[PDB]
Amino acid sequence: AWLASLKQTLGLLPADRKIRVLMLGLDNAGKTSILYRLHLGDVVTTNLETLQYKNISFEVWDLGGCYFSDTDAVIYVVDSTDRDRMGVAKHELYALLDEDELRKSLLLIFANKQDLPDAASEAEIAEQLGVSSIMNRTWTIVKSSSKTGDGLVEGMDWLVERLREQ
Amino acid sequence: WLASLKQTLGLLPADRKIRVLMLGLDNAGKTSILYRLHLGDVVTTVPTVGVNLETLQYKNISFEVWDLGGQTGVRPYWRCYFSDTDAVIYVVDSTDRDRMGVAKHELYALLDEDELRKSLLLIFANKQDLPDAASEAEIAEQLGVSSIMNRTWTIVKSSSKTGDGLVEGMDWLVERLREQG
Ligand SMILES: Nc1nc2c(ncn2[C@@H]2O[C@H](COP(=O)(O)OP(=O)(O)O)[C@@H](O)[C@H]2O)c(=O)[nH]1
Ligand SMILES: Nc1nc2c(ncn2[C@@H]2O[C@H](COP(=O)(O)OP(=O)(O)O)[C@@H](O)[C@H]2O)c(=O)[nH]1
Numbered sequence: 552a553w554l555a556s557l558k559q560t561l562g563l564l565p566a567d568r569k570i571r572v573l574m575l576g577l578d579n580a581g582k583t584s585i586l587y588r589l590h591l592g593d594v595v596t597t598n599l600e601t602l603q604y605k606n607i608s609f610e611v612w613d614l615g616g617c618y619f620s621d622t623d624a625v626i627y628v629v630d631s632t633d634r635d636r637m638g639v640a641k642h643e644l645y646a647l648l649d650e651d652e653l654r655k656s657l658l659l660i661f662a663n664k665q666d667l668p669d670a671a672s673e674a675e676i677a678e679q680l681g682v683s684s685i686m687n688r689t690w691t692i693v694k695s696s697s698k699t700g701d702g703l704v705e706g707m708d709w710l711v712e713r714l715r716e717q
Numbered sequence: 718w719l720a721s722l723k724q725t726l727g728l729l730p731a732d733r734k735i736r737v738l739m740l741g742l743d744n745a746g747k748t749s750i751l752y753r754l755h756l757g758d759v760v761t762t763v764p765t766v767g768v769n770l771e772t773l774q775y776k777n778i779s780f781e782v783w784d785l786g787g788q789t790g791v792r793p794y795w796r797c798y799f800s801d802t803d804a805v806i807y808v809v810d811s812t813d814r815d816r817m818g819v820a821k822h823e824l825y826a827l828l829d830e831d832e833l834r835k836s837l838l839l840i841f842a843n844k845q846d847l848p849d850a851a852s853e854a855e856i857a858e859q860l861g862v863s864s865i866m867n868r869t870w871t872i873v874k875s876s877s878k879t880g881d882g883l884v885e886g887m888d889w890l891v892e893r894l895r896e897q898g
């Protein structure tokens with residue numbers, strides 16, 4: 552669907568200018584699946600998963616079960632099906648954004664698992680994550696699905712063009 | 718030295734987690750000290766591309782080892798990595814006079830970190846089993862220890878071949894920790 556592949560998209564970032572992206576969310580949000588769905592190389596476990604591609608680093612841990620310096624973006628992943636864990640996803644998101652080391656990070660939310668029938672819309676997610684009153688930072692929500700692969704490149708294209716803009 | 722190592726280390730307040738960094742140039746004997754301590758498994762991880770980090774965890778006390786003063790590469794770095802350090806044990810190979818100025822240089826570049834403000838500093842003048850090992854006062858002079866500031870520090874002669882001085886060192890650290898009340 553999207554007009555360019557992911558590698559063309561990420562191709563656009565200054566071929567060197569190290570990019571650090573934290574992709575965080577509650578367990579079962581679908582973060583390991585997106586890492587895999589990106590088809591960018593393999594995931595290193597260390598608990599923590601990292602995917603390095605050219606200049607760009609992706610680091611993943613689960614929330615709600617220092618490290619934040621020099622972060623260019625936060626990808627926040629939510630399971631759009633999981634109604635009653637979504638208030639906890641909101642809390643953990645708010646915990647992240649009160650971090651001083653993160654004050655200039657872009658925020659991309661993936662409203663995820665949008666292939667499923669129970670899947671809230673972007674406005675239900677923005678309302679639930681109470682994003683719609685975050686006005687001190689550049690953010691968006693994009694509907695996504697690791698089972699399709701849908702939303703993912705759009706979301707990364709968002710990040711790439713916001714990163715170049717600065 | 719009187720006590721065994723375990724006895725020495727048991728003296729530490731159990732509900733106080735202790736982070737130690739054991740650092741210095743390659744070939745100082747760092748890895749060998751971790752095995753010579755007979756405290757259990759040495760675990761290797763890679764917290765960043767191009768860094769071999771060895772960790773030995775015993776009760777509340779953790780030892781971290783990586784090599785400094787690579788001729789190639791920037792100084793090994795990763796996020797945090799100096800945060801909540803209780804002590805640094807700086808290990809020198811007491812026979813490597815040739816590299817002793819570089820060992821000073823890397824000691825000095827550790828000591829200018831605030832994350833390492835009030836760390837205890839134990840210097841192990843290591844490999845003393847070897848007849849060509851420099852004196853304790855000779856080491857002090859070559860590491861320019863007289864310019865060291867604002868820290869509880871000492872130099873202890875040590876060897877992994879014989880195990881000598883190690884308990885002395887751990888005991889120094891252990892009691893200095895407690896002196897902090
Ligand atoms: N329907 C659907 N299921 C997904 C999707 N992504 C992940 N899953 C399933 O969600 C569960 C949690 O996924 P995982 O990637 O390990 O989440 P993690 O805890 O954030 O690392 C697994 O059963 C996945 O198969 C998705 O996009 N759509
Ligand atoms: N003679 C002697 N050799 C030592 C001593 N400690 C380590 N070695 C040896 O010195 C070399 C490197 O020691 P090692 O523990 O790998 O140093 P590291 O590079 O700081 O981790 C190897 O040949 C070790 O077996 C020691 O106390 N006396």
Ligand SMILES: [Mg+2]
Pocket residue numbers: 582583
């Ligand atoms: Mg996972």
Ligand SMILES: [Mg+2]
Pocket residue numbers: 747748749782
């Ligand atoms: Mg070693």
